[PDB]
């Protein structure tokens, strides 16, 4: 008749900073949405050095609601490090980042965890046109099937499988930014508008990120790049101490000064190739990024991968 | 009469990928080879990413057979990414990477496993003269007696020693580069003709990725040449401001733009040749290939090296 | 009536090197502060290679005196990394470390203890304006609310939980010049005159070493600031050799080595650029300093962070 | 009246390389040396993939003497990797490495241990004057009193505390060319004569690899000297883009080459130096060598240091 | 070539007590035997406080022979808490218990490992008709099918499985008692005849010692035979007391000492009863037997059963 | 030249009851002895409920000497209890219980010493002929060769090995009345006389214990005897009742009577037989004590025996 069930269904994390009398209306909102759904639910609350008195009502609120928990930081660090260490306190079986002032609806909330029901891994709450060869240029530069829209929305559900996938990684800070595109689950979207309504160097910077946080490419491309300058340089070089020797001396010190200039050029370039590619082993070597992410197994065990 | 044992005596690891309608006649041919053998096995199935419908087919042979194990991958990784996540999941005193459309004859399982029960830790399938200073080339620079032909086989048999010895090594994934040279075990090979018939960048790539993933070579080398290059030219430089001082001054702006630029080029090959050194210590310390591997103890238990 | 607890409530940390005759006045004046505090205490003295005869009365010390530990260090060592041995051996609720000549009075731990008991995690003893737009300068630099005086102390109390925060950080021997900026917990001053009575070097060291200490901003901002001056280069030079073709060849040598030296000065800063850009991300991935710290918690368990 | 006891109190090992006809010399000889000292001892033979016979009489040994241990390795690794391995498999208070051709003779174990005995921790045979400002520049380059001659020995005594403290370190496979110098223990030596009988380049090679083994000081330096010539050279062009303009012009294309020149090396300069600050920063990152290490304890008991 | 492997295949268990000038002959026979089986295996030697000098010489044995081990015992216990330390100390897929004066030929120790071959768990050494209803009583009262002749053999092959399921029990000293029917494996027997030449007594303790070893039967029919006893007893002595009350009063001392007797033997009885029902619980409670064994798993692995 | 051991060569036990101002002599005493023997040792007090200011001035001993450590009881158990406790918490190789008023000289602790090290495990110090037959019975009933005198000392030394086989068993605390003849090891004794100077029942109230305590068989040999006594007792009165009906009935009651008592006696003399068998079973099944003690090992190691 009556039972207790240890396991939280859905993890809810808010980072607050200076969120002093919005914490009722907040909380008023979240639970007359999260109640219909009759799952067991937490709400992590997630302080980063807030200077109004946001703590004291925090904890006023904790002290009569079972589902509040608060995550106190030692100072203020960014609202992106704090929506991380809320991830890294949440225990559930989906996680859902949610944004104090409420500017996406918590109603959202419904749709996205009935998409999560029906097998997708993260699911994206993506604004339906919010107010083009470039969308082709991400698509073929993503090299992966991904069809959410460009603003592919930070509010989002994440199953707790791509959660445990990426939390030892530095780019789960910023998720949104290709490590989506990297982890490659089942994925899908959810299509709203927002009553209150394009930065084109925003949708370049991201992309900036991606081909080098994901691609070791640019580096071996410049360095075999530059290595055949070098060698073209050292071979006109050579060709220009041949000449002058056996032909004229037309130009006093043109001659010398520019196979001095072609000589150091090229022996630069040597060593910068030869450093860029023990670079890039390096790198290699301490990418903390697994090689390949592992989604089912039949009539196999997980391999613990942590110590 | 009847006993059951748990051990897995060789483990065979099928990196799948739109094999939608071959799932029978693969499964047909891998099961007619392997039960003359008489000994106890597991199939390892990699599904990377397929768009057709290989998973449903995979589950519904993996219902009906205790033998055939599934690791499904998150996404489309490379085929050698998931030919390691099977060799990561599989459990067997043998692994055998198996290609699905079997261009190899599986037959060949029978003669890789009788070489493997002579001693052998590590037996390759090549090709019988598939359609030369070069091999002497490739010879001296391996440093270490290999005698198997170039195209030295990627249908093999690694015991469990070499398996283990390799499990944490970034150069798992591509094994025959250079690895296969650098462990160094028992080796062997097994000779056969392929009915369905020579790059030399390919061969010369292989070289190449050889002599930096395994040497500092190139990188002290080159530090110590730049190093005395930029004293000849700093010595070049010095006597040529010594010089056009006693001497005259017949060029004007001559003298001082080369002792510019030659000092300039010193001192950027100084700093290149420091920055090259501290990048190789850098290196060695994140380096995860161990010092040595030991093949066998007498008197002494192996030590942990895990954990 | 006699009771037995086995929890020390506060570390004193002392570094010895050749302090053989003051042994006694020191723990003389030690006993002499401490017993009114009424709390259980220890006290740690690190020897770093001392050359007279400080440890055998050390040890004359220890075996009459309960509260009295020693670490032998296994040569000299700084002072600052004896300092960091007897805070890594030191077990106490809060840890002072003290000098062992008492320049500053030992009755400042009264101070300290009772700021530490009003909820300050670190409390430091400054000077009382021992013998101006710089300290602006700092304080913008420090891009965190700091309000303690600019010499800001070495002898101090830290509670528990920022020794246990940054017992694994390379900064812990250099915890005043920005760590303490960067740990950012409650913190507070105490104000004290000294009997015996300003290097504006030392006063710009610490600022240089925390702008690259606790900031990649240098390096990204290099980076892009050279591969835009390499860009405008090459834009330079490819003008330069669209000039002299359609018009005249007024200088003969002069137009050739300026385009090679630009198009050489702009390939080598790209190299430089991209080299830059991922030895950054390389420090990003191997980088011990956390990316958040936690003050409190409520409802919930502080996660490992160890094993 | 019989009792056993399971410590062993020496190790000795010999790396054994085509050693096969002199096995029964070596170990009659080992025999006869380490009988007279009374004390349990074993002896670890590593065989790095030797061609001869060497094995199958080392087991024959084996099999005969319960104090001979045995370690494989896959293949032929250097002869300081194998005695790296046999001193990871040893397990005594003191170790010591021993050749195999027995040049130093076997009668210095005894003095060795009688100088462990008396509580030195490193103990080295150093050739008795074997066939000047240099031993004064390599004192002074150390930065730590050590008084063992030039030459300081390859057989040498070690004890368990120093095994232990190292036994992590890439600079173990070369323990003689600074880290004997860093650890900093309590070391002597032992004089003797060999009866069969000076390189300047290995005794300023092994000083080379030291001043960058244990010390970031030539980066740092480099680096800061670096910055101010290019400090100066962009203070000369930009002192030179402001001639020519107020004054004559009367060299046409000398001023705009060298200001272009200087603008670049100067540039170019910047970026080394900072990429230097922060390879020297990734550097002391990933160092496996500890800050400190610690001789005795009183009072204390030592921390874990492992996992 | 030469490979180590570290699993023993069988363990001989020699229980030695003054063997003195035996263990040459002993050794010299059991290797003469051992060495054609070509299985890696050691003997297990356990002296139990001999007076002469055997122990000696078995140390002088270990020192030359790899494969032999020993256990010394603080005093002399019995030859079987010999056997019982020997097996409990002995590493092997089967154990097999040797005599020490060889009575039993080891020669049938290649049939006994044939027969292990086959899939036997225990095989047994019975002597070929050494010099019936008991037969057919011993049978029925075995209530489980055994066929081994009465002798049954102590020179026998145990499975590991069979010692791992009796290792905590303490009837495993006394095996051949009736745990050998209680562990009802797989078991066989083979037949052999000894050239140098019946007790009742003994071939009835060992049924009287199974009978309530192994049953709680005898206690529960004896409390419920005594129950009833005592419930007539107490019926009769209702009525004699009845009796004489109702009719004459003849004998004047008789009917009332019976009264008397027949009440205090009915409640000691019943108290008798009720003490030996709690007993037999308790009983119960404190067994170190298991309530099953198993055999093999198929689709499951095997339970810890030990912490 | 300062070396520190952190292992305790030597454990004094005292229990303390009101031994207010004995402690300065007592001490005094023990270091004036201990301190010419060079080894660690520790000196554990242990107070049990003590009424005077015992603990106050243990405590005051404890603050100034490193060696002394106190074991205070939760009230006054007795002193072989205290004995019990503080050989629980002592560390050492060898363990001396020490009785606080030195009714035994120190003094004997050297010879104690001194037999230890010559390879003896318990070290007996037995009175010089302090102020038969029954030696002889004792002898026997010992069944173990034991050579020390009756009195046979409660002053002595006990080896690790020792101290940990027993630490486990209920008997411990009273060790000299049968344990010390169960545990065999290799044992000794050393005579002295005391200047200040033979009950019967305490010398047959230790046999009494000890026949029962490590043996079964008076309950074995009582069960079997009133077996046999009830089966004849049960056999007379199968013969009194064939009597009286075939010959005359001269006795009216004395028949009846006679048969009655017999068969109740016979019915419960086998009930009680039963229970005592039942009983002996489940003492077999709860015993601590283990089958067999382990002195010594060759290449074995020990059992862990604990969880």
């Given at each position: ?5 240890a ?83 949440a ?106 309504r ?70 630069q ?16 070597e ?20 942590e110590?």
């Open positions: 008749y009556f039972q207790s069930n396991t939280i269904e859905l993890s809810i994390v808010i980072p607050m900073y200076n969120e002093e009398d919005n914490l009722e209306h907040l909380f008023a909102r979240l639970l007359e949405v999260l109640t219909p759904l009759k799952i067991t639910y937490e709400i992590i609350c997630v302080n980063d050095g807030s200077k109004d008195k946001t703590l004291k009502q925090l904890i006023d609120c904790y002290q009569s609601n079972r589902q509040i928990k608060i995550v106190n930081l030692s100072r203020n660090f960014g609202k992106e490090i704090a929506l991380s260490a809320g991830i890294d306190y225990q559930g079986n989906a996680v859902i980042p949610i944004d104090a002032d409420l500017q996406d609806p918590p109603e959202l909330i419904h749709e996205l965890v009935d998409k999560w029901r029906e097998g997708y891994d993260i699911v994206y709450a993506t604004r339906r046109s919010r107010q083009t060869a470039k969308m082709f240029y991400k698509v073929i530069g993503r090299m992966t099937e991904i069809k959410i829209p460009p603003n592919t929305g930070d509010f989002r559900l994440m199953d707790r499988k791509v959660v445990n996938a990426i939390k030892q990684l530095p780019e789960r800070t910023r998720f949104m930014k290709g490590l989506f595109a990297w982890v490659g689950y089942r994925q899908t979207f959810v299509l709203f508008d927002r009553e209150p394009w930065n084109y160097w925003k949708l370049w910077n991201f992309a900036l990120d991606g081909i080098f946080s994901f691609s070791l490419l640019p580096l071996k491309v410049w360095t075999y790049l530059g290595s055949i300058i070098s060698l073209l340089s050292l071979a006109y070089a050579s060709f220009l101490i041949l000449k002058t020797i056996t032909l004229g001396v037309d130009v006093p010190g043109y001659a010398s000064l520019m196979v001095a200039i072609l000589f150091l050029g090229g022996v370039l040597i060593s910068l190739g030869v450093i860029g590619e023990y670079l890039g082993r390096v790198y290699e301490v990418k903390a990024r697994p090689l390949y992410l592992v989604s089912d197994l039949w009539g196999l065990e997980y391999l613990p991968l110590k």
